Design an enzyme around this catalytic site. Sequence first.
Site, PDB file in Angstrom:
ATOM      1  N   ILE A 192       2.745   1.728  -3.730  1.00 13.55           N
ATOM      2  CA  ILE A 192       1.864   2.149  -4.809  1.00 13.55           C
ATOM      3  C   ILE A 192       1.283   3.552  -4.651  1.00 13.55           C
ATOM      4  O   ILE A 192       0.667   3.867  -3.630  1.00 13.55           O
ATOM      5  CB  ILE A 192       0.645   1.183  -4.951  1.00 13.55           C
ATOM      6  CG1 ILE A 192       1.095  -0.288  -4.919  1.00 13.55           C
ATOM      7  CG2 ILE A 192      -0.126   1.503  -6.231  1.00 13.55           C
ATOM      8  CD1 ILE A 192       2.159  -0.641  -5.888  1.00 13.55           C
ATOM      9  N   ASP A 233      -1.437  20.300 -44.246  1.00 13.25           N
ATOM     10  CA  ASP A 233      -2.015  20.564 -45.566  1.00 13.25           C
ATOM     11  C   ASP A 233      -2.016  22.088 -45.617  1.00 13.25           C
ATOM     12  O   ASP A 233      -2.133  22.737 -44.580  1.00 13.25           O
ATOM     13  CB  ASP A 233      -3.452  20.052 -45.670  1.00 13.25           C
ATOM     14  CG  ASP A 233      -3.540  18.535 -45.641  1.00 13.25           C
ATOM     15  OD1 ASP A 233      -2.926  17.874 -46.508  1.00 13.25           O
ATOM     16  OD2 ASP A 233      -4.231  18.010 -44.748  1.00 13.25           O
ATOM     17  N   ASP A 247      -7.703  10.213 -45.394  1.00 14.27           N
ATOM     18  CA  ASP A 247      -6.623  10.680 -44.509  1.00 14.27           C
ATOM     19  C   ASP A 247      -6.555   9.814 -43.273  1.00 14.27           C
ATOM     20  O   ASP A 247      -5.535   9.770 -42.606  1.00 14.27           O
ATOM     21  CB  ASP A 247      -6.852  12.126 -44.051  1.00 14.27           C
ATOM     22  CG  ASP A 247      -6.754  13.111 -45.176  1.00 14.27           C
ATOM     23  OD1 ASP A 247      -5.695  13.129 -45.841  1.00 14.27           O
ATOM     24  OD2 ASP A 247      -7.733  13.867 -45.395  1.00 14.27           O
ATOM     25  N   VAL A 302       0.832  -1.192   0.000  1.00 14.87           N
ATOM     26  CA  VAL A 302       0.000   0.000   0.000  1.00 14.87           C
ATOM     27  C   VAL A 302       0.874   1.253   0.000  1.00 14.87           C
ATOM     28  O   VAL A 302       0.556   2.251  -0.648  1.00 14.87           O
ATOM     29  CB  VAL A 302      -0.912   0.029   1.236  1.00 14.87           C
ATOM     30  CG1 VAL A 302      -1.867   1.223   1.158  1.00 14.87           C
ATOM     31  CG2 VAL A 302      -1.691  -1.271   1.330  1.00 14.87           C
ATOM     32  N   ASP A 343      -8.458  15.439 -43.365  1.00  9.59           N
ATOM     33  CA  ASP A 343      -9.878  15.737 -43.214  1.00  9.59           C
ATOM     34  C   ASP A 343     -10.801  14.703 -43.867  1.00  9.59           C
ATOM     35  O   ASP A 343     -11.898  14.440 -43.362  1.00  9.59           O
ATOM     36  CB  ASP A 343     -10.187  17.152 -43.737  1.00  9.59           C
ATOM     37  CG  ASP A 343      -9.749  17.366 -45.179  1.00  9.59           C
ATOM     38  OD1 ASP A 343      -8.652  16.903 -45.550  1.00  9.59           O
ATOM     39  OD2 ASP A 343     -10.491  18.019 -45.946  1.00  9.59           O
ATOM     40  N   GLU A 379       4.777  16.162   3.970  1.00 15.88           N
ATOM     41  CA  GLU A 379       4.299  16.182   2.593  1.00 15.88           C
ATOM     42  C   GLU A 379       3.775  17.560   2.186  1.00 15.88           C
ATOM     43  O   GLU A 379       3.857  17.935   1.022  1.00 15.88           O
ATOM     44  CB  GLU A 379       3.234  15.104   2.376  1.00 15.88           C
ATOM     45  CG  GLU A 379       3.804  13.681   2.356  1.00 15.88           C
ATOM     46  CD  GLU A 379       4.994  13.525   1.402  1.00 15.88           C
ATOM     47  OE1 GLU A 379       4.880  13.923   0.226  1.00 15.88           O
ATOM     48  OE2 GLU A 379       6.044  12.994   1.818  1.00 15.88           O
ATOM     49  N   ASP A 417      -0.636  22.694 -54.989  1.00 20.41           N
ATOM     50  CA  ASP A 417       0.033  23.633 -55.886  1.00 20.41           C
ATOM     51  C   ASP A 417       1.091  22.928 -56.730  1.00 20.41           C
ATOM     52  O   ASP A 417       1.593  21.856 -56.362  1.00 20.41           O
ATOM     53  CB  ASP A 417       0.775  24.728 -55.088  1.00 20.41           C
ATOM     54  CG  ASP A 417      -0.157  25.690 -54.377  1.00 20.41           C
ATOM     55  OD1 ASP A 417      -0.840  26.476 -55.081  1.00 20.41           O
ATOM     56  OD2 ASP A 417      -0.205  25.663 -53.117  1.00 20.41           O
TER      57      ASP A 417
HETATM   58  N1  12D Z   1      -1.981  15.753 -59.308  1.00 14.20           N
HETATM   59  C1  12D Z   1      -2.359  16.828 -60.008  1.00 14.20           C
HETATM   60  N2  12D Z   1      -2.152  16.880 -61.420  1.00 14.20           N
HETATM   61  C2  12D Z   1      -2.555  18.022 -62.117  1.00 14.20           C
HETATM   62  N3  12D Z   1      -3.140  19.074 -61.463  1.00 14.20           N
HETATM   63  C3  12D Z   1      -3.372  19.083 -60.081  1.00 14.20           C
HETATM   64  C4  12D Z   1      -2.985  17.957 -59.329  1.00 14.20           C
HETATM   65  N4  12D Z   1      -3.279  18.135 -58.042  1.00 14.20           N
HETATM   66  C5  12D Z   1      -3.842  19.348 -57.976  1.00 14.20           C
HETATM   67  N5  12D Z   1      -3.898  19.928 -59.220  1.00 14.20           N
HETATM   68  C6  12D Z   1      -4.474  21.345 -59.608  1.00 14.20           C
HETATM   69  O1  12D Z   1      -4.315  22.279 -58.557  1.00 14.20           O
HETATM   70  C7  12D Z   1      -5.459  22.910 -57.948  1.00 14.20           C
HETATM   71  C8  12D Z   1      -5.418  22.763 -56.440  1.00 14.20           C
HETATM   72  O2  12D Z   1      -5.697  21.373 -56.228  1.00 14.20           O
HETATM   73  P1  12D Z   1      -6.139  20.586 -54.983  1.00 14.20           P
HETATM   74  O3  12D Z   1      -6.118  19.132 -55.285  1.00 14.20           O
HETATM   75  O4  12D Z   1      -7.512  20.988 -54.611  1.00 14.20           O
HETATM   76  O5  12D Z   1      -5.152  20.895 -53.809  1.00 14.20           O
HETATM   77  P2  12D Z   1      -5.263  21.483 -52.404  1.00 14.20           P
HETATM   78  O6  12D Z   1      -6.157  20.656 -51.603  1.00 14.20           O
HETATM   79  O7  12D Z   1      -3.933  21.516 -51.786  1.00 14.20           O
HETATM   80  O8  12D Z   1      -5.842  22.966 -52.492  1.00 14.20           O
HETATM   81  C9  12D Z   1      -6.579  22.323 -58.688  1.00 14.20           C
HETATM   82  O9  12D Z   1      -7.125  23.397 -59.490  1.00 14.20           O
HETATM   83  C10 12D Z   1      -7.278  22.799 -60.864  1.00 14.20           C
HETATM   84  O10 12D Z   1      -6.584  21.493 -61.053  1.00 14.20           O
HETATM   85  C11 12D Z   1      -6.030  21.338 -59.721  1.00 14.20           C
HETATM   86  C12 12D Z   1      -8.726  22.441 -61.261  1.00 14.20           C
HETATM   87  N6  12D Z   1      -9.495  21.362 -60.647  1.00 14.20           N
HETATM   88  O11 12D Z   1      -9.162  20.603 -59.772  1.00 14.20           O
HETATM   89  O12 12D Z   1     -10.645  21.072 -60.958  1.00 14.20           O
HETATM   90  C13 12D Z   1      -9.385  23.151 -62.257  1.00 14.20           C
HETATM   91  C14 12D Z   1      -8.873  24.208 -62.988  1.00 14.20           C
HETATM   92  N7  12D Z   1      -9.515  24.868 -63.930  1.00 14.20           N
HETATM   93  O13 12D Z   1     -10.502  25.482 -63.674  1.00 14.20           O
HETATM   94  O14 12D Z   1      -9.161  24.889 -65.081  1.00 14.20           O
HETATM   95  C15 12D Z   1      -7.544  24.604 -62.698  1.00 14.20           C
HETATM   96  C16 12D Z   1      -6.686  23.955 -61.658  1.00 14.20           C
HETATM   97  N8  12D Z   1      -5.392  24.495 -61.526  1.00 14.20           N
HETATM   98  O15 12D Z   1      -4.542  24.167 -60.791  1.00 14.20           O
HETATM   99  O16 12D Z   1      -4.962  25.419 -62.190  1.00 14.20           O
HETATM  100 MG    MG Z   2      -7.497  20.338 -48.855  1.00 16.92          MG
END
Ligand code: 12D
Ligand code: MG
Length: 994
Positions: free
Chosen positions: A307, A351, A707, A304, A703, A908, A627
């Site tokens: 512990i 992200d 994921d 006792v 999200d 204590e 991007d």
């Molecule tokens: N693996 C991959 N290969 C090629 N492209 C990728 C890509 N992953 C993301 N993108 C382009 O980048 C934009 C952001 O993408 P997203 O997947 O939502 O990332 P986030 O979650 O980080 O914001 C999207 O916008 C768009 O294409 C997408 C998109 N779309 O997803 O529908 C539509 C139009 N548009 O209107 O012409 C333009 C875009 N852009 O980047 O310029």
């Molecule tokens: Mg996102």
Amino acid sequence: MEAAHSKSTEECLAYFGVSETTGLTPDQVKRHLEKYGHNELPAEEGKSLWELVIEQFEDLLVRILLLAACISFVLAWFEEGEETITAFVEPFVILLILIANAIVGVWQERNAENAIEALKEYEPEMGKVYRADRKSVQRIKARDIVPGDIVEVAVGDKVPADIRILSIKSTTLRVDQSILTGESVSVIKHTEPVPDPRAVNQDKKNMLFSGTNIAAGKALGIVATTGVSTEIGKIRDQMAATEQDKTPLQQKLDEFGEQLSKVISLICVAVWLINIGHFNDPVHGGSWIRGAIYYFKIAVALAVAAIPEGLPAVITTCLALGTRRMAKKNAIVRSLPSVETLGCTSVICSDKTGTLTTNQMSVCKMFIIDKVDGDFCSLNEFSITGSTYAPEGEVLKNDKPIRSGQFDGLVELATICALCNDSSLDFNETKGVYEKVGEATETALTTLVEKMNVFNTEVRNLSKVERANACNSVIRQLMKKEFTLEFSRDRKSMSVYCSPAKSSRAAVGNKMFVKGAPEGVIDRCNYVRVGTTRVPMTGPVKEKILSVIKEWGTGRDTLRCLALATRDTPPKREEMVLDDSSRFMEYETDLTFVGVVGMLDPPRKEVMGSIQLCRDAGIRVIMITGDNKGTAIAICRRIGIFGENEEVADRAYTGREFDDLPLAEQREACRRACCFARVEPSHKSKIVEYLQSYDEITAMTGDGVNDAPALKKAEIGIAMGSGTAVAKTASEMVLADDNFSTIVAAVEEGRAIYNNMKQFIRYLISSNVGEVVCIFLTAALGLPEALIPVQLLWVNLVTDGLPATALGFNPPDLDIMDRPPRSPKEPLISGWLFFRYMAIGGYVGAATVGAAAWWFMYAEDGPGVTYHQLTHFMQCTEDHPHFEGLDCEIFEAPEPMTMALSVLVTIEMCNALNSLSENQSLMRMPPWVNIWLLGSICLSMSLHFLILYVDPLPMIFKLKALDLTQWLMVLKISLPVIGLDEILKFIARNYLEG
Ligand SMILES: Nc1ncnc2c1ncn2[C@@H]1O[C@H](COP(=O)(O)OP(=O)(O)O)[C@H]2O[C@@]3(O[C@H]21)C([N+](=O)[O-])=CC([N+](=O)[O-])=CC3[N+](=O)[O-]
Ligand SMILES: [Mg+2]
Ligand SMILES: C/C=C(/C)C(=O)O[C@H]1C(C)=C2[C@H]([C@@H]1OC(=O)CCCCCCC)[C@@](C)(OC(C)=O)C[C@H](OC(=O)CCC)[C@@]1(O)[C@H]2OC(=O)[C@@]1(C)O
Ligand code: NA
């Protein structure tokens, strides 16, 4: 058939030997059901209440205690006397604590929910199939659907399994699969095969994923997979196979327990080897039975005393209070034990969109061609004001607001942005502002069209809900949108086919409006629009365009650029296969370049600073984004992840580049990288594993349902408050505001909570050390029990518990975020602190044994038998010492014990004060530094007087109110411990440097 997306519809029907018009026969069903099993995720392993109650008595210390309860029960069964009113009390209290302990354990395991069982929210009860045993579509239980089944889905339906689309009955099939691919907008589906056997889900345009929803249309398809074989089922198996480890504290506490039972048993073996002389006493007579009881009695007290029975409740209470406090800071902790881990975070994977940035997109710049003359070229660049989706803002050139409509190029620019767009604007009354109705990028275009106002319209004559689409609606009534060729990752562009409205029956006048990533779009341009005229695309002109795009996307502007073009002579309507995305790039060829728009997704106002805190706390920050790479890096530089000019070629990777690296290089890549652009869900999991191979304590955000695996794998999975419930249930923490900063703030908070926990863990364990010394001392000196279990238990659960809790409120060190992450392997007690607690323990063991032995001897109210040595005996049969008298039951007097207990309690209370700081003198860090502690000490002392005076209590505890002289001898013995530590602290402060 897991590779369905890449096979033809005919090849899928063939594979399963099924008829599209009839469906499977009853024999095919029985056979397919037996082969692939039912269409459902496995059910959680049921855990019975009995099993849940038994697992409570699984810890090593609860066992020791339970054993102690037995000995205490049997020993209370053959007790000498008749104090039954205060006999079976002891074994009952022990047993009761084990019960409460178990109740708490069972309680928690009841209202707890697992992420896996949450995945089941995405599997519908019913489904609609076509089987040979009937002609009309019959709706059976999703559970009974199988691979090969011809299935039917329509708007509003929840996809029952992973299905290959056979034929789209409606004009178009739209699906909301946001939860699996993070695609906010509902996406369009087709029936043609996707050639890549390894296509990621976003490219599987001919598949319907189990768990998703049909946004529009009606479609017929064939089931490719079911159960754990679907996309969501594969996420389910990944999660199930993820083994999570105990937090560092749980591990230290577990090693503490193992060693503690090793010490206990050792101290029992010792008390035996120090009484081996009894084997020389005469066999006949003697207190054989009364001696055995004596040994077993110190054994119980020993267990006792060792512990720290109240430590777990102190830990829980401190975690709960800290948890409620973090909430106010927008950090919702789901797992209390995670707080420590958060404080140990060494790497935060985040992200970008909505967490590092605001997800509020607005166009900031845009340009069109001014003129082309041989090697000479000039552009017409503009800027736009307003960072909201609101139509509030204005265009400018050289910082001077101009009229967009005054530039032909801009009129077409706006046309394209207006028509080649699937989003709009809405005036949310609940917030009084505006909300994007669609993709953030497209809506930005919508907003731009409003600010530009190419056709000087009276918008000020409308309200905040009417002018939300003023200048846009204008452009619509001009060109009729026939059909739209949706965006595709491979061509990185989209377009809409338009025919004039003013020309009902015209054989010409049709235009395709194109929008997309610069490179691809510009390469497919053969013409450049200059005002209303048109000229061929030339080398000098292309370089000029690319030149400015590079500066905007890779420079300090960190803008996402979109090229806008027009197909002046688009193919004839009938000559286009609007069902084979593979030919869309073909239709978007021979284009005329109109312009470029650059938009910004601005960094959170507080992230710039938070990124600095992380650098100052020695925490790495990895940004994960969609991007393109160049813009990803530029953004990293902008928020501080990368230096404005530091080389980062081997610290920034695209998903593609990373897969090209061999396994050995991917590992190294993760140890130094701070930027991951365009990665698939699988990458997050691998990043974590690689970081864990360097022993990093990783925090990872997510999200969507996709994921979940990674969120579960990371030591601290962090979910978005605005995200899915699945991601939440798989995370240790949820950011109510989605802000990256809330993370950094939660980590500091984790740091500040651990330091305080350390102080009260060392405080409670330290007292146990002392308690044991007292029991072991009163076993080697053959003295009567100075302290008994019921008294110790009160001190460990109540008396010390309040002070322990108060220490949780200790003010945090000002330089908390100025030192590297704590090492998980760092022990709570070692070196000089180890020696300190031993010294204090020996002191405590003597201060208690003495106070009692002081009453039995040199006392004004007790037996004046000084140096009589109670060691000699307690048998009372020879009366060797006393030559005449009749009294021996004083050896059970409550007065001596009350001295022992008051010394422990007081010591204590003093030791709680010595625990405000590890090495700071009470002179530098006074007691009033923590009013909670002072207040707690008063509460504890008044509770001590409670069990001394309130009659029912003093008997139950075998206590007896003390005299002012007996009390003054307490303070005399106790108070000095403060001086003991002060000296030990002084030695640690001066003669221990490095
Ligand atoms: N693996 C991959 N290969 C090629 N492209 C990728 C890509 N992953 C993301 N993108 C382009 O980048 C934009 C952001 O993408 P997203 O997947 O939502 O990332 P986030 O979650 O980080 O914001 C999207 O916008 C768009 O294409 C997408 C998109 N779309 O997803 O529908 C539509 C139009 N548009 O209107 O012409 C333009 C875009 N852009 O980047 O310029
Ligand atoms: Mg996102
Ligand atoms: C709790 C009560 C007692 C009496 C005990 O002996 O605990 C030991 C013990 C299990 C440890 C020891 C105790 O060792 C001693 O006190 C030395 C021998 C004295 C003989 C006494 C004879 C009457 C801790 C308490 O000693 C001091 C002096 O502070 C420090 C520390 O504990 C921690 O770091 C706490 C982490 C939960 C642990 O060495 C720990 O074992 C580990 O693995 C650790 C890393 O845990
Ligand atoms: Na986790």
